[PDB]
């Protein structure tokens, strides 16, 4: 039922997150950079966005910025799943419009629990 836009440049990361998302029942759509993620938003409007920070072409902070300046995308919840484990990196993402930030390495159990929280809100 619920659609989830998966955004990460790592193919290995996308696979295991897609597995746990599909194991609950959520359909997923993948995007290997920030620009493709925004390109695919013209096709459909997801119920959740799992977003990486570091990636080529367009990065996650500029995605988070562009999601707010457009009216249609700004009320979609965003979980930032990223390798950047700094406090000032978290605070920038939350200020840019991200609803939650999770550090890598991550627990799939805790990650899915947070995905449930935002979808069942």
């Amino acid at each position: 039922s619920k659609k989830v836009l998966l955004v990460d440049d790592s193919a290995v990361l996308r696979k295991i997150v897609s597995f746990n998302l599909k194991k609950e029942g959520y359909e997923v759509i993948e995007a290997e950079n920030g620009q493709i993620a925004l390109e695919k938003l013209s096709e459909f409007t997801p119920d959740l966005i799992v977003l990486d920070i570091m990636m080529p072409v367009m990065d996650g902070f500029t995605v988070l910025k562009k999601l707010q300046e457009k009216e249609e995308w700004k009320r979609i919840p965003v979980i930032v799943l990223t390798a950047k484990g700094g406090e000032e990196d978290e605070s920038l993402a939350l200020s840019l419009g991200a609803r939650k930030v999770m550090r890598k390495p991550f627990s799939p159990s805790q990650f899915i629990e947070e995905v449930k929280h935002l979808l069942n809100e």
Partner: protein, 235 residues
């Protein structure tokens, strides 16, 4: 110096946590999902943990080799190696990593094979893998014709291996500093490419232990060319 050391330490944390994220996520998924996980997926998920450990091992071997080369406790046992074969086996190891970034791995030869040479095969394989990895890592971001070509040649009573690419390129202010320990070209393009800045420092020392040299020619946008000369004969 020091400001670099600090960046270096941060770079180890970043490059090493990428395969660890996979190892940790795939392992917990297999553990928590044994009931709802078919056999081919289990084997596939096991294979990811094994492959991500091998990359994680190679990065630790980069740290170990650097400390051995810094302390001057690394040997160089030479033997009659076929260099034309040795480059091909090195290229086969990179093919998987090259396919991930849409990079082609060519091997051309100006002189006819087999090319005999008296060098350490283990350490020259490490030299070629470093240059091949940098060809894939620092390639163009969005392009259809990305490649890494290894040109073998014989010159100056030695062997001149050239590692050509059409990647991002290196600016002239950095061209001298690329071979230094911990050095990386900090820019908007290379913000998300992992690395310690040890590879070329390890490669310069290994090449200079053989009585050879390494240098670079590059243009920003076009690509880079890494020339490495080594002597052939024993005496």
């Amino acid at each position: 110096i020091d400001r670099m050391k600090t960046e270096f330490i941060a770079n180890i944390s970043h490059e090493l946590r990428t395969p660890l994220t996979a190892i940790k996520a795939y392992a917990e998924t297999i553990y928590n999902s044994l009931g709802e996980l078919d056999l081919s997926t289990l084997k596939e998920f096991l294979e990811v943990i094994i492959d991500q450990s091998n990359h994680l091992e190679n990065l630790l071997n980069e740290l170990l080799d650097f400390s051995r080369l810094e302390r001057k406790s690394l040997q160089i046992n030479r033997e009659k190696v076929d260099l034309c074969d040795l480059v091909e086996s090195a290229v086969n190891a990179i093919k998987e990593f090259a396919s991930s970034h849409n990079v082609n791995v060519l091997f051309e030869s100006n002189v006819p094979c087999p090319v005999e040479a008296y060098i350490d095969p283990t350490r020259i394989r490490q030299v070629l893998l470093n240059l091949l990895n940098n060809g894939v890592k620092y390639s163009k971001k969005d392009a259809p014709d990305k490649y890494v070509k290894v040109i073998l040649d014989e010159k100056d009573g030695g062997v001149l291996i050239i590692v050509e690419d059409n990647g991002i390129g290196i600016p002239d202010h950095a061209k001298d500093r690329i071979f230094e320990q911990f050095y990386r070209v900090d820019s908007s393009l290379t913000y998300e490419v992992p690395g310690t800045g040890l590879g070329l420092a390890i490669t310069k020392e290994i090449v200079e232990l053989h009585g050879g040299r390494i240098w670079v020619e590059s243009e920003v946008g076009k690509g880079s060319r890494f020339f490495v000369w080594i002597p052939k004969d024993r005496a």
